[PDB]
RNA sequence: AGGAUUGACAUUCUUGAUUUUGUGGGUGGUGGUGCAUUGAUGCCCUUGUUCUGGGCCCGCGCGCUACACU
């Protein structure tokens, strides 16, 4: 009973005050459309035409003038900082755990920022990494091209001419696997794609040829790809197929010499090295 | 005049629910005649929806001279009414849709709408809530300072400065207007205050949230007005990261 | 052990035929037995009257 | 202001830097509890505007035909 009372009470006022909304936009409607198209005629005979502002002005004017931006938009505090830090260590070091148990076409850094060997052109290539992102109005392509040529460059760069002295190119290289594995951290999009590429020259060649056009890139190769990735886990499409194929170098071409076996052993340390933390 | 049946629109717009303006307010801004409008309208029928239609109204009619012409009108003293009548102390969804809307053509908003806000007896929870509704969306760092600047060349008092706190908690950039409107607001509170204007702990926090990283690439008089700060306003919550971050501050 | 769950007819009454998805041929078998129970009634109250 | 965007007389005109193309990152109290009736005040959470809804108060027993490496 007291069910049928509120409902058939609730049910009769919201229905109430649905007729009440319906007759003031029926009245809304008949008012204003039939007071619209009487109006036409008196629409247009019905005519009827400090220092605070200044200073005002002023500041408007300064305000064009000068203009800034701020920092980075919060507080750098050290506890919190360091929680998150150690947060974000724990998310790396879980993940990976995680995840084991789960107009540049390859000439363009040597036409352009190759001076002599090294010194001019890496310092060139930051020069164009500078430029490119300040006057990134939208940019995918061209940063992916030119990524894409900066690799190029440590390919056909690496393997010919490391024949000056060892300190030389040991902090040339340290320099340039430091800052190349700190910006293609937070990316993989291109990175992947010229691993595609390499894995791709490297079996085509290695089809090709005998041994005599076996480049010295491949370490270097080895070398960026380890130091770029942590290769703990299993499912990546990346380290794995270069891996197989060196195994595939090691277990079909022949080594009849020292430089040879030289080769070989040094592939079997840098997978040492890959199972030092896989 | 105007067509005369105006008094009966303003009943249906006293109590009419869902739809927009009538055509007839929709072809009185290409005219001039909307005051002898108003005058007949009564303005008592405030619905919602005509509240959204008013604040794009007279934003959209807002320049110089028709805003000095209506923008002290029934606007803010129906805001009053309301604020005095409600008793949750909520900003209500027309309020903060109106004030929120109204901001969108700031070329003369900040001069109509901000400044008059004080007009009889303003209170420090209106200047917050103001500074809320206000603060939430973007604005345009010119019209801020053109605002601000006007504003802060006001005295020092709570109703106008808990509003440039939040002012302050919105984290703006740092432009020259700010380094120099800061620094006359330095000279606004310092040491006839002495004896009775106090400052409490939530002006300290104002302090911290300006404090924390309004120190991006300025000069060396911010540096021995901010010393002068620590050695006369020192209170337990102003020392280890605002001292950790003056030191880690350059020019 | 392999698990199964119930088959429940939650509400359910064996009085009273309950809602059947069978539209096509269990509607027929309420409304059928009803007009079989109705020409029984007709036809036992038009013999007692003849009797 | 050389078409950055804003209410259109069923595109078509009476609006002027509220901005947008590429990208970092920050959120939220307007609910109220504990203290003087305005004090970085402990606490579950954050991301409140517009129409209609739903059954009711056959039972019994006898025969015949099934359900069976019989």
Request: aromatic share 10%; proline share 4%.
């Given at each position: 009973?007291?069910?049928?009372?509120?409902?058939?009470?609730?049910?009769?006022?919201?229905?109430?005050?649905?007729?009440?909304?319906?007759?003031?936009?029926?009245?809304?409607?008949?008012?204003?459309?039939?007071?619209?198209?009487?109006?036409?005629?008196?629409?247009?005979?019905?005519?009827?035409?400090?220092?605070?502002?200044?200073?005002?002005?002023?500041?408007?004017?300064?305000?064009?003038?000068?203009?800034?931006?701020?920092?980075?938009?919060?507080?750098?505090?050290?506890?919190?900082?360091?929680?998150?830090?150690?947060?974000?260590?724990?998310?790396?070091?879980?993940?990976?755990?995680?995840?084991?148990?789960?107009?540049?076409?390859?000439?363009?850094?040597?036409?352009?920022?190759?001076?002599?060997?090294?010194?001019?052109?890496?310092?060139?290539?930051?020069?164009?990494?500078?430029?490119?992102?300040?006057?990134?109005?939208?940019?995918?392509?061209?940063?992916?091209?030119?990524?894409?040529?900066?690799?190029?460059?440590?390919?056909?760069?690496?393997?010919?001419?490391?024949?000056?002295?060892?300190?030389?190119?040991?902090?040339?290289?340290?320099?340039?696997?430091?800052?190349?594995?700190?910006?293609?951290?937070?990316?993989?999009?291109?990175?992947?794609?010229?691993?595609?590429?390499?894995?791709?020259?490297?079996?085509?060649?290695?089809?090709?040829?005998?041994?005599?056009?076996?480049?010295?890139?491949?370490?270097?190769?080895?070398?960026?790809?380890?130091?770029?990735?942590?290769?703990?886990?299993?499912?990546?499409?990346?380290?794995?197929?270069?891996?197989?194929?060196?195994?595939?170098?090691?277990?079909?071409?022949?080594?009849?010499?020292?430089?040879?076996?030289?080769?070989?052993?040094?592939?079997?340390?840098?997978?040492?090295?890959?199972?030092?933390?896989? | 005049?105007?067509?005369?049946?105006?008094?009966?629109?303003?009943?249906?717009?006293?109590?009419?629910?869902?739809?927009?303006?009538?055509?007839?307010?929709?072809?009185?801004?290409?005219?001039?005649?909307?005051?002898?409008?108003?005058?007949?309208?009564?303005?008592?029928?405030?619905?919602?929806?005509?509240?959204?239609?008013?604040?794009?109204?007279?934003?959209?009619?807002?320049?110089?001279?028709?805003?000095?012409?209506?923008?002290?009108?029934?606007?803010?003293?129906?805001?009053?009414?309301?604020?005095?009548?409600?008793?949750?102390?909520?900003?209500?969804?027309?309020?903060?849709?109106?004030?929120?809307?109204?901001?969108?053509?700031?070329?003369?908003?900040?001069?109509?709408?901000?400044?008059?806000?004080?007009?009889?007896?303003?209170?420090?929870?209106?200047?917050?809530?103001?500074?809320?509704?206000?603060?939430?969306?973007?604005?345009?760092?010119?019209?801020?300072?053109?605002?601000?600047?006007?504003?802060?060349?006001?005295?020092?008092?709570?109703?106008?400065?808990?509003?440039?706190?939040?002012?302050?908690?919105?984290?703006?950039?740092?432009?020259?207007?700010?380094?120099?409107?800061?620094?006359?607001?330095?000279?606004?509170?310092?040491?006839?205050?002495?004896?009775?204007?106090?400052?409490?702990?939530?002006?300290?926090?104002?302090?911290?949230?300006?404090?924390?990283?309004?120190?991006?690439?300025?000069?060396?008089?911010?540096?021995?007005?901010?010393?002068?700060?620590?050695?006369?306003?020192?209170?337990?919550?102003?020392?280890?990261?605002?001292?950790?971050?003056?030191?880690?501050?350059?020019? | 052990?392999?698990?199964?769950?119930?088959?429940?007819?939650?509400?359910?009454?064996?009085?009273?035929?309950?809602?059947?998805?069978?539209?096509?041929?269990?509607?027929?078998?309420?409304?059928?037995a009803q007009l079989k129970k109705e020409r029984k009634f007709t036809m036992?109250e038009?013999?007692?009257?003849?009797?």
């Open positions: 009973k007291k069910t049928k009372a509120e409902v058939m009470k609730e049910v009769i006022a919201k229905s109430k005050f649905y007729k009440q909304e319906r007759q003031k936009a029926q009245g809304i409607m008949e008012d204003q459309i039939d007071n619209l198209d009487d109006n036409f005629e008196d629409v247009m005979s019905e005519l009827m035409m400090t220092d605070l502002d200044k200073e005002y002005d002023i500041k408007v004017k300064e305000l064009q003038l000068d203009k800034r931006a701020a920092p980075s938009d919060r507080t750098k505090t050290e506890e919190e900082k360091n929680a998150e830090a150690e947060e974000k260590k724990r998310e790396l070091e879980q993940q990976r755990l995680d995840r084991m148990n789960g107009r540049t076409h390859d000439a363009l850094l040597d036409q352009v920022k190759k001076l002599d060997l090294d010194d001019h052109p890496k310092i060139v290539k930051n020069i164009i990494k500078a430029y490119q992102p300040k006057l990134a109005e939208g940019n995918k392509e061209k940063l992916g091209k030119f990524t894409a040529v900066l690799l190029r460059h440590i390919i056909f760069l690496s393997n010919q001419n490391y024949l000056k002295n060892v300190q030389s190119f040991k902090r040339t290289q340290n320099a340039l696997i430091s800052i190349l594995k700190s910006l293609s951290e937070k990316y993989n999009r291109e990175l992947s794609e010229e691993c595609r590429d390499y894995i791709n020259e490297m079996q085509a060649r290695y089809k090709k040829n005998h041994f005599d056009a076996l480049s010295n890139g491949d370490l270097v190769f080895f070398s960026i790809i380890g130091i770029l990735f942590s290769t703990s886990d299993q499912y990546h499409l990346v380290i794995t197929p270069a891996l197989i194929l060196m195994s595939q170098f090691l277990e079909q071409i022949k080594f009849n010499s020292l430089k040879r076996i030289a080769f070989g052993a040094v592939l079997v340390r840098i997978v040492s090295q890959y199972q030092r933390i896989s | 005049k105007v067509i005369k049946a105006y008094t009966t629109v303003g009943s249906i717009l006293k109590t009419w629910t869902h739809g927009k303006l009538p055509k007839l307010f929709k072809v009185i801004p290409s005219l001039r005649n909307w005051q002898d409008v108003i005058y007949v309208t009564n303005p008592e029928e405030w619905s919602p929806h005509v509240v959204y239609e008013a604040t794009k109204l007279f934003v959209s009619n807002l320049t110089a001279k028709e805003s000095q012409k209506f923008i002290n009108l029934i606007l803010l003293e129906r805001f009053r009414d309301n604020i005095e009548t409600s008793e949750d102390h909520s900003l209500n969804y027309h309020i903060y849709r109106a004030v929120k809307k109204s901001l969108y053509k700031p070329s003369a908003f900040f001069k109509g709408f901000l400044f008059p806000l004080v007009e009889t007896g303003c209170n420090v929870r209106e200047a917050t809530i103001a500074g809320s509704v206000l603060a939430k969306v973007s604005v345009p760092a010119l019209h801020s300072s053109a605002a601000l600047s006007y504003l802060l060349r006001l005295p020092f008092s709570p109703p106008t400065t808990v509003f440039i706190k939040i002012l302050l908690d919105k984290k703006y950039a740092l432009p020259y207007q700010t380094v120099d409107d800061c620094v006359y607001y330095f000279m606004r509170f310092r040491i006839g205050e002495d004896a009775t204007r106090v400052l409490p702990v939530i002006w300290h926090k104002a302090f911290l949230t300006f404090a924390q990283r309004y120190k991006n690439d300025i000069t060396q008089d911010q540096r021995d007005f901010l010393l002068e700060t620590v050695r006369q306003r020192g209170h337990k919550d102003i020392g280890p990261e605002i001292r950790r971050e003056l030191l880690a501050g350059a020019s | 052990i392999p698990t199964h769950a119930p088959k429940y007819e939650e509400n359910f009454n064996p009085d009273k035929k309950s809602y059947d998805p069978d539209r096509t041929r269990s509607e027929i078998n309420k409304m059928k036992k038009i013999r007692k009257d003849a009797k």
